Design a protein around this ligand. Structure first.
Ligand SMILES: [Mn+2]
Ligand SMILES: [Mn+2]
Ligand SMILES: [Mn+2]
Length: 233
Protein backbone atom coordinates (compact mmCIF):
# COMPACT_ATOMS: atom_id res chain seq x y z
CA UNK A 1 0.00 0.00 0.00
CA UNK A 2 2.23 2.79 1.34
CA UNK A 3 5.42 0.99 0.20
CA UNK A 4 6.32 3.84 -2.20
CA UNK A 5 4.36 7.02 -1.30
CA UNK A 6 4.98 10.46 -2.86
CA UNK A 7 4.16 12.18 0.44
CA UNK A 8 6.12 11.78 3.66
CA UNK A 9 3.70 11.21 6.56
CA UNK A 10 6.42 12.29 9.06
CA UNK A 11 7.33 15.67 7.45
CA UNK A 12 5.61 19.05 7.96
CA UNK A 13 3.67 20.18 4.86
CA UNK A 14 3.82 23.92 5.64
CA UNK A 15 7.19 24.07 7.56
CA UNK A 16 15.92 32.67 4.21
CA UNK A 17 18.53 31.82 1.53
CA UNK A 18 17.72 28.90 -0.80
CA UNK A 19 19.22 25.41 -0.48
CA UNK A 20 21.69 24.38 -3.16
CA UNK A 21 22.61 20.79 -2.33
CA UNK A 22 25.58 20.13 -4.67
CA UNK A 23 25.51 17.36 -7.29
CA UNK A 24 28.54 15.48 -8.57
CA UNK A 25 29.12 12.87 -11.25
CA UNK A 26 27.60 9.76 -9.68
CA UNK A 27 26.42 6.19 -10.31
CA UNK A 28 22.87 6.75 -8.98
CA UNK A 29 20.41 6.71 -11.90
CA UNK A 30 18.93 10.16 -12.45
CA UNK A 31 15.27 11.07 -13.04
CA UNK A 32 15.94 12.15 -16.65
CA UNK A 33 18.02 9.01 -17.36
CA UNK A 34 15.15 6.81 -16.09
CA UNK A 35 12.59 8.64 -18.27
CA UNK A 36 14.85 8.74 -21.35
CA UNK A 37 15.65 5.01 -21.25
CA UNK A 38 12.00 4.00 -20.60
CA UNK A 39 10.35 6.06 -23.35
CA UNK A 40 7.79 3.97 -25.23
CA UNK A 41 9.10 2.40 -28.47
CA UNK A 42 6.27 4.38 -30.13
CA UNK A 43 7.74 7.63 -28.75
CA UNK A 44 11.32 6.62 -29.63
CA UNK A 45 10.25 5.87 -33.24
CA UNK A 46 8.54 9.29 -33.57
CA UNK A 47 11.65 11.13 -32.29
CA UNK A 48 14.17 9.10 -34.37
CA UNK A 49 11.95 9.67 -37.44
CA UNK A 50 11.93 13.42 -36.80
CA UNK A 51 15.71 13.31 -36.15
CA UNK A 52 16.43 11.71 -39.58
CA UNK A 53 14.11 14.22 -41.29
CA UNK A 54 16.04 17.12 -39.70
CA UNK A 55 19.50 15.71 -40.54
CA UNK A 56 18.48 15.35 -44.23
CA UNK A 57 16.73 18.74 -44.32
CA UNK A 58 19.35 20.82 -42.50
CA UNK A 59 22.56 18.86 -43.27
CA UNK A 60 25.23 17.91 -40.69
CA UNK A 61 26.21 21.59 -40.13
CA UNK A 62 22.64 22.88 -39.98
CA UNK A 63 21.74 20.02 -37.63
CA UNK A 64 24.70 20.89 -35.35
CA UNK A 65 23.68 24.58 -35.39
CA UNK A 66 20.05 23.81 -34.53
CA UNK A 67 20.77 21.32 -31.71
CA UNK A 68 23.52 23.55 -30.27
CA UNK A 69 21.29 26.64 -30.10
CA UNK A 70 18.29 24.89 -28.51
CA UNK A 71 20.55 23.14 -25.98
CA UNK A 72 22.48 26.26 -25.00
CA UNK A 73 19.38 28.49 -24.95
CA UNK A 74 17.79 25.92 -22.61
CA UNK A 75 20.82 26.04 -20.31
CA UNK A 76 21.18 29.87 -20.41
CA UNK A 77 17.48 30.29 -19.57
CA UNK A 78 17.96 28.06 -16.50
CA UNK A 79 21.13 29.84 -15.39
CA UNK A 80 19.40 33.21 -15.72
CA UNK A 81 16.48 32.08 -13.53
CA UNK A 82 18.86 30.61 -10.92
CA UNK A 83 20.65 34.00 -10.77
CA UNK A 84 17.34 35.94 -10.62
CA UNK A 85 16.10 33.90 -7.62
CA UNK A 86 19.44 33.62 -5.66
CA UNK A 87 21.63 36.44 -4.15
CA UNK A 88 23.47 39.43 -20.68
CA UNK A 89 20.70 36.80 -20.99
CA UNK A 90 17.87 39.04 -19.67
CA UNK A 91 16.86 40.35 -23.13
CA UNK A 92 15.65 36.87 -24.25
CA UNK A 93 12.04 36.03 -25.09
CA UNK A 94 12.08 33.18 -22.56
CA UNK A 95 12.87 35.59 -19.70
CA UNK A 96 10.25 38.08 -20.96
CA UNK A 97 7.78 35.15 -21.17
CA UNK A 98 8.15 34.13 -17.48
CA UNK A 99 7.77 37.68 -16.02
CA UNK A 100 4.03 37.19 -15.27
CA UNK A 101 4.88 33.84 -13.61
CA UNK A 102 7.73 35.34 -11.52
CA UNK A 103 5.41 38.03 -10.05
CA UNK A 104 3.50 35.15 -8.34
CA UNK A 105 6.62 33.30 -7.08
CA UNK A 106 7.72 33.70 -3.44
CA UNK A 107 9.44 31.90 -0.56
CA UNK A 108 12.13 30.23 -2.68
CA UNK A 109 13.40 27.35 -0.51
CA UNK A 110 15.66 25.55 -3.04
CA UNK A 111 17.28 26.19 -6.44
CA UNK A 112 19.11 23.75 -8.76
CA UNK A 113 19.45 21.45 -5.80
CA UNK A 114 20.17 17.72 -5.73
CA UNK A 115 17.47 15.30 -4.54
CA UNK A 116 18.02 11.61 -3.78
CA UNK A 117 15.31 9.12 -2.82
CA UNK A 118 16.45 6.95 0.15
CA UNK A 119 14.22 3.90 -0.54
CA UNK A 120 13.80 4.03 -4.35
CA UNK A 121 17.45 4.92 -5.13
CA UNK A 122 17.28 7.51 -7.87
CA UNK A 123 18.76 11.01 -7.90
CA UNK A 124 17.94 14.30 -9.62
CA UNK A 125 18.35 18.05 -9.83
CA UNK A 126 15.14 20.04 -9.36
CA UNK A 127 15.01 23.56 -10.81
CA UNK A 128 13.22 25.30 -7.98
CA UNK A 129 11.06 24.93 -4.86
CA UNK A 130 8.93 27.97 -4.08
CA UNK A 131 5.39 29.20 -3.46
CA UNK A 132 3.40 29.85 -6.65
CA UNK A 133 0.31 31.90 -5.70
CA UNK A 134 0.88 30.92 -2.04
CA UNK A 135 1.15 27.15 -2.73
CA UNK A 136 4.55 25.44 -2.22
CA UNK A 137 5.68 23.32 -5.18
CA UNK A 138 8.49 21.82 -7.19
CA UNK A 139 8.68 24.07 -10.26
CA UNK A 140 10.36 22.98 -13.49
CA UNK A 141 11.01 25.62 -16.13
CA UNK A 142 10.71 24.51 -19.76
CA UNK A 143 11.60 26.20 -23.05
CA UNK A 144 9.04 25.96 -25.88
CA UNK A 145 11.92 24.75 -28.03
CA UNK A 146 13.06 21.49 -26.41
CA UNK A 147 16.75 21.63 -25.42
CA UNK A 148 17.29 17.88 -26.20
CA UNK A 149 14.47 17.44 -28.74
CA UNK A 150 15.27 13.92 -30.04
CA UNK A 151 15.58 12.21 -26.60
CA UNK A 152 12.89 14.08 -24.58
CA UNK A 153 9.12 14.05 -24.59
CA UNK A 154 7.24 17.08 -23.30
CA UNK A 155 4.49 14.65 -22.25
CA UNK A 156 6.89 13.17 -19.62
CA UNK A 157 7.24 16.57 -17.90
CA UNK A 158 4.62 15.80 -15.19
CA UNK A 159 6.51 12.58 -14.33
CA UNK A 160 9.80 14.48 -13.91
CA UNK A 161 8.17 16.89 -11.46
CA UNK A 162 6.57 14.12 -9.35
CA UNK A 163 9.90 12.21 -9.35
CA UNK A 164 11.66 15.26 -7.85
CA UNK A 165 9.02 15.98 -5.17
CA UNK A 166 8.92 12.28 -4.21
CA UNK A 167 12.73 12.19 -3.99
CA UNK A 168 12.85 15.43 -1.97
CA UNK A 169 10.15 14.14 0.43
CA UNK A 170 12.33 11.07 1.16
CA UNK A 171 15.70 12.84 1.40
CA UNK A 172 17.23 13.62 4.82
CA UNK A 173 18.91 16.77 3.40
CA UNK A 174 15.38 18.30 3.20
CA UNK A 175 13.47 18.89 6.47
CA UNK A 176 10.17 19.95 4.80
CA UNK A 177 7.61 18.30 2.52
CA UNK A 178 6.24 19.45 -0.85
CA UNK A 179 2.74 18.44 -1.97
CA UNK A 180 2.22 20.30 -5.30
CA UNK A 181 4.01 20.57 -8.66
CA UNK A 182 4.27 23.24 -11.35
CA UNK A 183 5.49 23.10 -14.96
CA UNK A 184 6.19 26.44 -16.64
CA UNK A 185 6.56 26.61 -20.43
CA UNK A 186 8.36 29.82 -21.47
CA UNK A 187 7.93 30.81 -25.15
CA UNK A 188 10.86 31.90 -27.35
CA UNK A 189 8.86 34.80 -28.89
CA UNK A 190 8.10 36.50 -25.50
CA UNK A 191 4.43 35.42 -25.34
CA UNK A 192 3.20 34.88 -21.73
CA UNK A 193 4.41 31.59 -20.17
CA UNK A 194 1.92 28.79 -19.51
CA UNK A 195 1.69 27.40 -15.95
CA UNK A 196 0.46 23.82 -15.49
CA UNK A 197 -0.20 23.67 -11.75
CA UNK A 198 -0.53 20.18 -10.25
CA UNK A 199 -2.32 19.77 -6.90
CA UNK A 200 -1.65 16.92 -4.42
CA UNK A 201 -4.29 14.68 -6.03
CA UNK A 202 -2.89 15.05 -9.58
CA UNK A 203 0.72 14.58 -8.36
CA UNK A 204 -0.34 11.24 -6.77
CA UNK A 205 -1.92 10.13 -10.05
CA UNK A 206 1.30 10.92 -12.00
CA UNK A 207 3.52 9.46 -9.21
CA UNK A 208 1.94 6.05 -9.87
CA UNK A 209 2.95 6.42 -13.53
CA UNK A 210 6.50 7.43 -12.45
CA UNK A 211 6.87 4.24 -10.35
CA UNK A 212 5.83 2.18 -13.39
CA UNK A 213 8.64 3.90 -15.35
CA UNK A 214 11.15 3.44 -12.48
CA UNK A 215 10.35 -0.28 -12.08
CA UNK A 216 10.50 -0.76 -15.88
CA UNK A 217 14.03 0.71 -15.73
CA UNK A 218 15.16 -1.46 -12.78
CA UNK A 219 13.52 -4.54 -14.40
CA UNK A 220 16.36 -4.47 -16.99
CA UNK A 221 19.52 -6.56 -16.47
CA UNK A 222 22.16 -3.91 -17.38
CA UNK A 223 20.79 -1.45 -14.75
CA UNK A 224 21.44 -4.02 -11.97
CA UNK A 225 25.15 -3.47 -12.66
CA UNK A 226 26.59 -0.17 -11.46
CA UNK A 227 26.29 2.51 -14.18
CA UNK A 228 29.20 4.63 -15.34
CA UNK A 229 29.22 7.94 -13.49
CA UNK A 230 27.41 10.97 -14.91
CA UNK A 231 26.07 14.36 -13.90
CA UNK A 232 22.41 14.27 -15.00
CA UNK A 233 19.29 16.11 -13.81
MN1 LIG B 1 16.65 21.42 -14.43
MN1 LIG C 1 13.60 22.95 -16.23
MN1 LIG D 1 19.80 13.71 -18.18
Amino acid sequence: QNWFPIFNPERSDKPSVPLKIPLQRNVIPSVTRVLQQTMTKQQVFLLERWKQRMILELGEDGFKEYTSNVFLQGKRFHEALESILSPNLLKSGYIESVQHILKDVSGVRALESAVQHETLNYIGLLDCVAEYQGKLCVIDWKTSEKPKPFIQSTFDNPLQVVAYMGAMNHDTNYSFQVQCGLIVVAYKDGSPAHPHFMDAELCSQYWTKWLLRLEEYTEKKKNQNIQKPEYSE
